[PDB]
Design an enzyme around this catalytic site. Structure first.
Site, PDB file in Angstrom:
ATOM      1  N   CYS A  69       0.814  -1.345   0.384  1.00 15.28           N
ATOM      2  CA  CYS A  69       0.102  -0.098  -0.262  1.00 15.28           C
ATOM      3  C   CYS A  69       0.724   1.536  -0.269  1.00 15.28           C
ATOM      4  CB  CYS A  69      -1.381  -0.034   1.403  1.00 15.28           C
ATOM      5  SG  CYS A  69      -2.800  -0.827   0.668  1.00 15.28           S
TER       6      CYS A  69
HETATM    7  C1  P3T Z   1      -0.742   3.041   5.358  1.00 16.73           C
HETATM    8  N1  P3T Z   1      -0.302   3.453   4.584  1.00 16.73           N
HETATM    9  C2  P3T Z   1       1.520   3.601   4.164  1.00 16.73           C
HETATM   10  C3  P3T Z   1       2.501   3.568   5.227  1.00 16.73           C
HETATM   11  C4  P3T Z   1       4.299   3.655   4.991  1.00 16.73           C
HETATM   12  C5  P3T Z   1       4.559   3.774   5.693  1.00 16.73           C
HETATM   13  N2  P3T Z   1       6.262   3.458   5.953  1.00 16.73           N
HETATM   14  C6  P3T Z   1      -2.405   3.776   5.350  1.00 16.73           C
HETATM   15  C7  P3T Z   1      -2.990   2.870   6.852  1.00 16.73           C
HETATM   16  C8  P3T Z   1      -2.741   3.722   8.428  1.00 16.73           C
HETATM   17  O1  P3T Z   1      -1.633   4.761   7.938  1.00 16.73           O
HETATM   18  P1  P3T Z   1      -1.450   5.640   8.840  1.00 16.73           P
HETATM   19  O2  P3T Z   1      -0.078   7.372   9.167  1.00 16.73           O
HETATM   20  O3  P3T Z   1      -2.091   5.954  10.589  1.00 16.73           O
HETATM   21  O4  P3T Z   1      -0.752   4.301   9.938  1.00 16.73           O
HETATM   22  C9  P3T Z   1      -5.023   3.274   6.185  1.00 16.73           C
HETATM   23  N3  P3T Z   1      -5.054   3.473   4.887  1.00 16.73           N
HETATM   24  C10 P3T Z   1      -3.771   3.440   4.203  1.00 16.73           C
HETATM   25  C11 P3T Z   1      -5.517   3.199   2.403  1.00 16.73           C
HETATM   26  C12 P3T Z   1      -2.899   2.670   4.043  1.00 16.73           C
HETATM   27  O5  P3T Z   1      -2.384   2.404   3.260  1.00 16.73           O
END
Ligand code: P3T
Ligand code: P3T
Ligand code: MG
Lengths: 376, 363
Positions: free
Chosen positions: B312
């Site tokens: 992701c």
């Molecule tokens: C997380 N996406 C990638 C983060 C990579 C960090 N090196 C993600 C989250 C959770 O994000 P957070 O900042 O609260 O941990 C939630 N939803 C989606 C779609 C994501 O890709």
């Protein structure tokens, strides 16, 4: 790489030092100490900051079964991205109705695996992806992910095209989602996104299409590393205001990861050896950038570091990881008291995108996670 | 380019095993080993497991007559499990816990590296059992100065610890063989100073790894690369035995990566393809190894594209700007020179499965 203690029988406190030293004595280094009380604290703080938003914990930053159980017991929902994450929540008895699958780009098998568990909410951001759901139209409801370097999310105009096409194809649209990015320090990103989504929802209705039921505001809530970030209540204040403009018939989800897990883990590494190089003392630790500090590479991270040993002369030092790679350096320049081999180096805010992104390079053993305080 | 038979083999492998895959050609392992042996006559080649610690590579090389370069207990366990006699091994991690030393000794590996007095002292308890290489640097994390090498060699005599000789590692993917030549000259002089101080003469020079391979640009053929190195080694006393620790040169060209397109979208004038392998998997070398690999397709209407990994994370992009033919979901993206510091540095981020390694031409 993990076990639980179910029966125990800036500067660190004497109690924390004791716990750290006892843990190394019992389990050996390197370790990651996971405190379930902090998991609960963080969840509760976010719930209080963002009332009337269903919080789906994103497994990605710390997909740990104890974290899942702790959050389930607390009343959390979950955000899944892969079959592996589906399997983890399934094994911990998470009801599928508490889950959403948010990976925007999926193989047919990824959809089938999630559906088999019972997860029936998925994300799309393009027509190619939407087509994948024709075969599942009776079974799914979709969130359409918008974006406003970004890898996912469609434009507002594209979102309307996707929503109109879903109607043609008899595929249910649950609503809209977005993710402003991880460790977002400016809440105005959320506000602007929320306004845009609100306008898109209005356009759907004006076009005579089924009204959207859900807004998912994604993750990205920030935590303190070495710089102070906005307190979570203050951060969410403008978010709450933007959300208040939505129709009463829309309910709201979020996908917090880092905010919940990051503060809950403390890393413990030990000094394997040492040498003076060009007037600096190099310490070679048993954990580094191919291990728990892999976030230095993949997450552009910087963690507060300390030592149990305190006082006396501070010496210009380098903290190196255990691998043979010159790239494996955790701190290029850091002032530290003189350490002996076996002395401990402690990292804070080590919960999110750390062990999750560890490798097995050189076959060095990964830090073992020790889970504390799950019950009570 | 891919040959018609390469294409057939890739497609057949995907048909049988799915994707993503790493196709390991044991013949190329053999070829690289033989080519380096010919280029560096009279040098004993110790394959560094680090870049690709795969059992089939170990077996293939064992059969070829290769020796081995170990860095950890895990690597010791690997060669042990494949029946490699301990006398074909050296342990070269400069910084070791007491357990690391004991584990290697248990297997029977008795050659170790030191680059400082703190480390030397760890060997008092094993003086009857070990012989040591003293690692010099001339770069950043390991290796002592030539002057410090002398202090280490002198106090080893005081402590009754045997010194096998000297070692160095000029760095991975060294494209100019002149760094080896300068290293060798300096080691030759340190050897002279040892004899002149009345200390036991050094029997061994270990010239490390670092021999380069072709990625997106061609590097000097190995014969030519090593010619100045052989010349520099020829100035050593005839009694000095020379070792090397090649990793990348042997394994990098032997592996071809195969990923498939999971999905796709136009994002501001580029088609993004989302593959089932990426920077958290086989392309982890883009991050840790500052790498760039040749990338191709099976398929001429080249269109501006981005190759994304499966995770992701927006950081998980393999190529930000690449001209490709239009691909359909399921179509393949192939990487060359994917052997070294690739799968070895893969993660389990998001719980995406690691690419399966398929051994070809094993026998
Ligand atoms: C997380 N996406 C990638 C983060 C990579 C960090 N090196 C993600 C989250 C959770 O994000 P957070 O900042 O609260 O941990 C939630 N939803 C989606 C779609 C994501 O890709
Ligand atoms: C390898 N050292 C770290 C390489 C990290 C690449 N991202 C190494 C080798 C093998 O080097 P190679 O260039 O031939 O593969 C040999 N000997 C020592 C002491 C090493 O550290
Ligand atoms: Mg539901």
């Amino acid at each position: 790489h993990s076990q639980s203690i179910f029966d125990i029988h800036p500067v660190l406190s004497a109690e924390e030092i004791h716990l750290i030293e006892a843990s190394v004595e019992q389990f050996g280094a390197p370790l990651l100490l996971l405190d379930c009380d902090v998991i609960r604290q963080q969840y509760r703080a976010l719930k209080n900051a963002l009332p009337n938003v269903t919080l789906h914990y994103a497994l990605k930053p710390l997909p740990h079964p104890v974290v899942v159980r702790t959050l389930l017991a607390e009343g959390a929902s979950f955000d899944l991205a892969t079959t592996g994450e589906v399997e983890l929540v399934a094994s911990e008895g998470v009801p599928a109705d508490l889950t959403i699958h948010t990976h925007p780009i999926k193989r047919d098998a990824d959809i089938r695996d999630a559906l088999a568990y019972g997860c029936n909410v998925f994300v799309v951001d393009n027509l190619n992806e939407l087509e994948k759901f024709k075969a599942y139209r009776d079974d799914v409801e979709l969130l359409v992910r918008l974006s406003f370097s970004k890898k996912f999310g469609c434009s507002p105009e594209q979102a309307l095209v996707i929503i109109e096409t879903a109607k043609e194809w008899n595929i249910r649209i649950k609503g809209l989602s977005f993710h402003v990015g991880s460790q977002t320090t400016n809440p105005n990103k959320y506000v602007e996104a929320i306004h845009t989504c609100r306008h898109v929802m209005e356009q759907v209705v004006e076009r005579g299409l089924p009204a959207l039921s859900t807004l998912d505001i994604g993750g990205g809530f920030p935590v303190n590393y070495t710089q102070q970030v906005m307190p979570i209540d203050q951060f969410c204040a403008p978010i709450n205001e933007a959300l208040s403009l939505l129709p009463e018939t829309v309910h709201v989800l979020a996908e917090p990861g880092r905010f919940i897990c990051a503060p809950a883990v403390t890393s413990v590494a030990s000094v394997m050896g040492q040498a003076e190089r060009e007037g600096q003392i190099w310490y070679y630790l048993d954990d580094g950038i191919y291990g728990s500090f892999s976030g230095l590479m993949f997450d552009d991270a910087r963690y507060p570091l300390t030592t149990i040993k305190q006082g006396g002369e501070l010496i210009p030092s380098v903290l190196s990881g255990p691998t043979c790679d010159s790239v494996d350096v955790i701190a290029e320049n850091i002032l530290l008291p003189k350490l002996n081999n076996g002395d401990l180096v402690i990292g804070r805010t080590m919960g999110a995108y750390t062990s999750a992104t560890a490798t097995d390079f050189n076959f060095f053993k990964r830090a073992q996670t020790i889970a504390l305080n799950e019950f009570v």
